[PDB]
């Protein structure tokens, strides 16, 4: 009988872990172009003159 | 002109070759070398001026 009530609990926190992955994918995918724009002008405004 | 967007030093020119899912630059630059030391001034006065 506990099996069934086992099953209602893991099916729900595994939804939850998998849209916490989810979202932090999204959210690292923002913070890359970020960096990747503080990266150019590191290279643009500090190591020249733009 | 942009610094580093054509690889590191003054850039001359670049070639594309083709790889399987991608492309490689090859980035031809310039880079300086054998400095020597010396003494400057901001301007010269010559005749009060
Ligand atoms: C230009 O002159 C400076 C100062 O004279 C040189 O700096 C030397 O740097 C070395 C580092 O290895 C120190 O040990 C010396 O004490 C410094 N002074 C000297 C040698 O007088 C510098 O190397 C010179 N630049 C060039 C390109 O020759």
Same mark, same amino acid.
């Given at each position: 009988?506990?099996?069934?009530?086992?099953?209602? !609990?893991?099916?729900?926190? !595994?939804?939850?872990?998998? +849209?916490?992955?989810?979202?932090?994918?999204?959210?690292?995918?923002?913070?890359?172009? %970020?960096?990747?724009?503080?990266? +150019? #002008?590191? %290279?643009? $405004?500090?190591?020249?003159? %733009? | /002109?942009?610094? *580093? =967007? $054509?690889? #590191?030093?003054?850039?001359?020119? %670049? =070639?594309?070759?083709?790889?399987?899912?991608?492309?490689?630059?090859?980035?031809?630059?310039?880079?300086?070398?054998?400095? /020597?030391?010396? +003494?400057?001034?901001?301007?010269? $006065?010559? *005749?009060? /001026?």
């Amino acid at each position: 009988e506990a099996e069934v009530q086992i099953d209602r !609990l893991i099916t729900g926190r !595994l939804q939850s872990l998998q +849209t916490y992955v989810t979202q932090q994918l999204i959210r690292a995918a923002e913070i890359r172009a %970020s960096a990747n724009l503080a990266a +150019t #002008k590191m %290279s643009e $405004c500090v190591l020249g003159q %733009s | /002109k942009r610094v *580093d =967007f $054509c690889g #590191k030093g003054y850039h001359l020119m %670049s =070639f594309p070759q083709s790889a399987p899912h991608g492309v490689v630059f090859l980035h031809v630059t310039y880079v300086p070398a054998q400095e /020597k030391n010396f +003494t400057t001034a901001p301007a010269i $006065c010559h *005749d009060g /001026k």
